[PDB]
């Protein structure tokens, strides 16, 4: 395939939804409700543009029940992204805003589907780079849908032919090696596994990590230095021991000790049976 | 003095003309600025014709916490000093916390810095006096501390005033803010990066760092190059690490007076206890001198911006 570009006059941009780490989302129309994210890199370079096109080509061939569909892009008004529009609230809204009260069965199931989708993404060698409860939607309250995966070329504006990842996004899910931004490519499968570990912390504690640290830059420095770690004491009492042990494995400071998603997905399913 | 007492009593008078603050009573004039946190518009309160600055913080927080933030914000009614931006009222509507304050037609010293490139030492002396007195009023009269001193939070106006703004008064608002995207630079003191606030001294560090930046016209972490200095993209984690494990920044030796250099040097001592406190800075040689100088700040500001 090739030209995944959407012309002008085909996208009915609607109410402004909100801005995130690398774009501002509007609810547009395009053969049905869609999510139009106006990228921050509105003026892209021809080298950055072609890299963005290549990555769009890899994201379009993704199809999984736990993955938000990637429908292409547009560049008429400004560079934007067109993705499947999701009903209901995100996982972040359920856990930390709406304070929905799930049962441990449903919580572990949400962790399973999330690992399911993540396992599919890594199966196609796709690094999410921004895994968090904000990018996990519960379509119809039942199924899980991961969004805002990939898109490394639209994150970290380029200079001409370089893309030095200027660390952006929410810091709570960033792995230490990502925080430091020191060795070549910090974003790896294990960096996603770490973020997944922080999502597990969300599910098993109902809190965001570092509930006693209200300094953004203090968390950045201490987490990057290996001084700060999510306090696992905050895990609910009804949480399975095996789940807690898996969470601790995903949050290992040294990324080489974190498991991959095939093993993670197996551990979650095993402890879901013995329940 | 007297002119300050006039203006303070005049602000309270105009503030009493403002009753309940509703989203409909505001008409949007022009945008003033924005940044990792919210956005600020210049607005007109139709029930009283008053022109105010309205900051809009969009936080995705549970309502219980949001209600506590609004309640905590009402302390700002007690902050009435010529070095603190006037506060009209804070409320919540359409999913955004709105905090309405007095309009400063000069803007933040961040914008003034860009329009000016560098700010003269004579002017930074007046700015230092204002910041020192502002922090003092917050420390003594309210036992609250800024916790976010930087050029973007020092406001100025055509009447020559220099006021503090965006200072930490709502604990819950700080916690909710803690879940934000990483910035590009930090004025945080080293003890706060490794620990917690150490009294007003931690704010004095940020004041010093802001002075160095405004004096040279460039964020001083890392320090300028050898020939970048005679010419008068570091990672965020490397900046925080440089502030913690590297010697503090300083001013060029030949451009600025010794009193000023020693002033910022005592403000940037990495150990918070050895660092100078408000009591020491108030009677420092640089502040003593800059207080006797008759500098026309309002004229300089309106010239730098382009007003008459
Ligand atoms: C992790 C982290 O950084 N936490 C943190 C750390 C220190 C500060 C803040 N904080 C903030 O950042 N802002 C800026 C971003 C908008 C505020 O405006 C802001 C604010 N407003 C405000 C103040 C004074 C007047 I007079 C009018 C106003 F409207 N008040 C009341 C606050 O009590 C705080 C606590 C604010 C947040
Ligand atoms: N496909 C979508 N369908 C519906 N709502 C969406 C969609 N994508 C994003 N949103 C919402 O739009 C708002 C902003 O989203 P977004 O720009 O992705 O910021 P974010 O997800 O919170 N952080 P990030 O995803 O890393 O940029 C949030 O309220 C999201 O829940
Ligand atoms: N009362 C005010 N009067 C005039 N301009 C204001 C006022 N309050 C804020 N501004 C402007 O709004 C801009 C952004 O507001 P603010 O949310 O405080 O961001 P910031 O302080 O620049 N950086 P940050 O604290 O990281 O969000 C500032 O640079 C000011 O120029
Ligand atoms: Mg999202
Ligand atoms: Mg501010």
Assess whether the C-beta atom of A130 lies below 6 angstroms from ligand 2.
yes
Convert chain A into a string of H (helix), E (strand) and C (coil).
CCCCEECCCCCEEEEEEEECCCEEEEEEECCCEEEEEEECCCCCCHHHHHHHHHHHHHHHCCCCCCECCEEEEECCCCCEEEEECCCCCEHHHHHHHCCCCCCHHHHHHHHHHHHHHHHHHHHCCCCCCCCCHHHEEEECCCEEEECCCCCCCCCCCCCCCCCCCCCCCECCCCCHHHHHCCCCCCCCHHHHHHHHHHHHHHHHHCCCCCCCCCCHHHHHHHHHCCCCCCCHHHCCCCCCHHHHHHHHHHCCCCHHHCCCHHHHHHHHHHHHHCC
Assess whether the C-beta atom of B111 lies below 6 angstroms from ligand 3.
yes
Resolution in A: 3.5
Say yes or no: domain A91-273 is CATH 1.10.10.60: no
Question: What residue segments make up the domains of chain B, in order of their start?
Answer: 1-105, 106-308
Query: Which CATH superfamily hosts domain A5-84?
Result: Phosphorylase Kinase; domain 1 (3.30.200.20)
Q: Per the structure block, which two tokens stand in for B134?
A: 């502002």
Test the B interface: residue of A97, A171, A176, A214 with most B CBs within 10 Å: A214
Sequence-distant (6+) residues with CB within 8 A of B24 are none
Chain B residues whose C-beta is within 8 A of a chain A C-beta are 58, 60-62, 171, 174-175, 177-184, 186, 188, 192-195, 233, 235-238, 240-241, 244
Q: What are phi and psi of B83, to 5 degrees?
A: -110, 5
Distance (Å) from CA B37 to ligand 1 centroid: 8
User: How many residues make up chain A in this entry?
Assistant: 275
Q: Look at B192 and A218 and tell me if their CB atoms are within 8 Å.
A: yes
**Residue list for the binding site of B for U0126:** 55, 166-169
Q: Look at B194 and A218 and tell me if their CB atoms are within 8 Å.
A: yes
Question: What residue segments make up the domains of chain A, in order of their start?
Answer: 5-84, 91-273
Q: How many CB contacts within 8 angstroms connect chain A with chain B?
A: 85
| Cα–Cα dist B209/B204, whole Å | 9
3-state helix, strand, coil in chain B (%, to 5): 45, 15, 40
Query: What CATH class has B106-308?
Result: mainly alpha
Q: Is B293 exposed, middle or buried (0-12, 13-18, 19+ CB in 10 A)?
A: exposed
Chain A residues whose C-beta is within 8 A of a chain B C-beta are 18, 21, 92-93, 96-99, 164, 166-172, 174, 179-181, 208, 210, 213-222, 224-225, 227
Query: Which of B171, B195, B240 faces A220 most closely, judged by CB atoms?
Result: B240
């Amino acid at each position: 395939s090739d030209d995944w570009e959407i012309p002008d006059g085909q996208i009915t941009v609607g109410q402004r939804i909100g801005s995130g780490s690398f774009g501002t989302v509007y609810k547009g129309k395009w053969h049905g409700d869609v999510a139009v994210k106006m990228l921050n890199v509105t003026a892209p370079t021809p080298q950055q543009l072609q890299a963005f096109k290549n990555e769009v080509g890899v994201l379009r061939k993704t199809r999984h029940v736990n993955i938000l569909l990637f429908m292409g892009y547009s560049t008429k008004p400004q560079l934007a992204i067109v993705t499947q529009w999701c009903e209901g609230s995100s996982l972040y809204h359920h856990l930390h805003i709406i304070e929905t009260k799930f049962e441990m069965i449903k919580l572990i199931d949400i962790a399973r589907q999330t690992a399911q989708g993540m396992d599919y993404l890594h199966a196609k060698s796709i690094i999410h780079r921004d895994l968090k409860s904000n990018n996990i939607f519960l379509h119809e309250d039942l199924t899980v849908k991961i969004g805002d995966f990939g898109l490394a070329t639209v994150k970290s504006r380029w200079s001409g032919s370089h893309q030095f990842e200027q660390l952006s996004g929410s810091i709570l899910w960033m792995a230490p090696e990502v925080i430091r931004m020191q060795d070549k490519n910090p974003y790896s499968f294990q960096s996603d596994v770490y973020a997944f570990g922080i999502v597990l912390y969300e599910l098993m504690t109902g809190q965001l990590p570092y509930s006693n640290i209200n300094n953004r830059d203090q968390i950045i420095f201490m987490v990057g230095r290996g001084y700060l770690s999510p306090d696992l004491s905050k895990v609910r009492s009804n949480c399975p021991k095996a789940m807690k042990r898996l969470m601790a494995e995903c949050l290992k400071k040294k990324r080489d000790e974190r498991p991959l998603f095939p093993q993670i997905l197996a551990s979650i399913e095993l402890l879901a049976r013995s329940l | 003095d007297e002119q300050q007492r006039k203006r303070l009593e005049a602000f309270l008078t105009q503030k009493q003309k403002v009753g309940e603050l509703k989203d409909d009573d505001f008409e949007k004039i022009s945008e003033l600025g924005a940044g990792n946190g919210g956005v600020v518009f210049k607005v007109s309160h139709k029930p009283s014709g008053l022109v105010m600055a309205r900051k809009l913080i969009h936080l995705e927080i549970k309502p219980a916490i949001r209600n506590q933030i609004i309640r905590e914000l009402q302390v700002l009614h007690e902050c009435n000093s010529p070095y603190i931006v006037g506060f009209y009222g804070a409320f919540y509507s359409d999913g955004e916390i709105s905090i309405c304050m007095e309009h400063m037609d000069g803007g933040s010293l961040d914008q003034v810095l860009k329009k000016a490139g560098r700010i003269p030492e004579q002017i930074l002396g007046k700015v230092s006096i204002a910041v020192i007195k502002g922090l003092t009023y917050l420390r003594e009269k309210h036992k609250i501390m800024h916790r976010d001193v930087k050029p973007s939070n020092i406001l100025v106006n055509s009447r020559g005033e220099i006021k503090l703004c965006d200072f930490g008064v709502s604990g819950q608002l700080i916690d909710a803010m803690a879940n934000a995207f990483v910035g590009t630079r930090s004025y945080m003191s080293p003890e706060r990066l490794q620990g917690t606030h150490y009294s007003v001294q931690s704010d004095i560090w940020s004041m010093g760092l802001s002075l160095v930046e405004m004096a040279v016209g460039r964020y001083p972490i890392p320090p300028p190059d050898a020939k970048e200095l005679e010419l008068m993209p570091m990672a965020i984690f490397e900046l925080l690490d440089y502030i913690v494990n590297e010697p503090p920044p300083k001013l060029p030796s030949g451009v600025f007076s010794l009193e000023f250099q020693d002033f910022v040097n005592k403000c940037l001592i990495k150990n918070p206890a050895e660092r100078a406190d408000l009591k020491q800075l108030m009677v420092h040689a640089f502040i003593k001198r800059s207080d006797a100088e008759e500098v026309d700040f309002a004229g300089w500001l309106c010239s730098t911006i382009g007003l008459n």
